[PDB]
Amino acid sequence: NPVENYIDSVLNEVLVVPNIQPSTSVSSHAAPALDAAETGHTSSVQPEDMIETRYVITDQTRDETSIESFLGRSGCIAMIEFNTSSDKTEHDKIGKGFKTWKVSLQEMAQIRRKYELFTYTRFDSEITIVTAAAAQGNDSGHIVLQFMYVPPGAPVPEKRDDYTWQSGTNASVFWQEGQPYPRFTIPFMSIASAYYMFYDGYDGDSAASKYGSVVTNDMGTICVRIVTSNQKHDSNIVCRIYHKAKHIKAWCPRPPRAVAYQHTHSTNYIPSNGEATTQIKTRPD
Amino acid sequence: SPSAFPYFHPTKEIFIPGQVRNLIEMCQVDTLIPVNNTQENVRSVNMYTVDLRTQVDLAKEVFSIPVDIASQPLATTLIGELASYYTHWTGSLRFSFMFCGSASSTLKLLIAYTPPGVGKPKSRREAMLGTHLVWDVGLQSTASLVVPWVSASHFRFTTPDTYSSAGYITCWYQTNFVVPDSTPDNAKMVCMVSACKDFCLRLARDTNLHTQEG
């Protein structure tokens, strides 16, 4: 009955863990302690096979290690920065009145490393926006922002009041000072059945052809502007984009990243430094 | 929350082999422990291999490690890496040892888990008073020691803490590494770790095992 699944869900008891059964001394030709790891299978041996156990009613649950629990938390994926101007000519320009950001999960290591535990992932994305407009003068002025999602092949804005900001077909969300953090869902939007966290392939046959997950699905661009025209007092605006996966599926688990990331969409790990090589978290003894 | 794409139909979900529903499915897979982890070995496959050889003295130590899953050297194993995304752990651990000598080589080892309160065992005689396996190397090349969950509290911290520490594995010669002629008098063992059926992780956190600068 669905009420049992609801009660288990509010208790976080959906994913029950086996009890420890009582065991006793054994003298047998069966040797659970011995196996062949050469098979590629992990030994099935459990505590009851190798020590005399008591009965324990196991209270633990695995709900918080579900992939929905593990990946389904909001983390920063972009910091989008622009510095407004009192000059009408400069306020129209990129980096001043508006900024663009090529969408990916690749720029922030905390999120990137978690999703890269899997080869393929499929999820809907909850986006939440945290804007902080640092006043450089004696007043904030009126702060109204527009965030426009520009899909691949749609025209990207080149000016703060370009025709593209009309948003006649693109999704836009508006934010003004004192408004709660903007939030919207992007449904799972790949042309494939899952996102590639990794892709051992190319966009072509040639020396110049691109390699890796960047080939597989262009994710479009977030464009942000201040909607307000030029104002007396400048603002250093930073919009932080937070992403939570929802309705998550993940396939083909991978070793975690063991060394610093160097570049987006690349497994490259060799640093630029000539004295310092790539560093692991294995401590010597 | 409202969808930004209000009539969009996502691409069909096709069957893909290898779906993962829970991180404990990954913790239940053996991964190699970098037990050797000396400065000479941490840039190489050699960190995963423990040296065995014919001893002149009886009952010598082979290696030791702390058993706490997110402590060194366990930290960079898959179970240690996944555990370091969580604040608490519980349940039993399986340590597996694969002997990589020749088929003509013979060996017994005593592999012991020592609970907290006495430090690391200083001899095989101290170690064998704890939970242990006497492993006979034979046609089956792998043995497993289960570190049973033996704790005052239902959970332990994954971060090192003197109140919460899990104790030690030590490995000792039981008998000796014995070989006939025309056989190397030395060999390697590979050490692995995975979760038993009772193993769980609780309170999700940022990992201490990865950082970003710039």
Binding site: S9, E68 | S3
Partner: peptide, 17 residues
């Protein structure tokens, strides 16, 4: 569970499996 929006993707976290 009440769903306020016309898209399946708009719903909160899915049930565990």
């Amino acid at each position: 569970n009440i769903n306020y929006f016309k898209d399946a993707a708009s719903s909160g976290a899915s049930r565990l499996d």
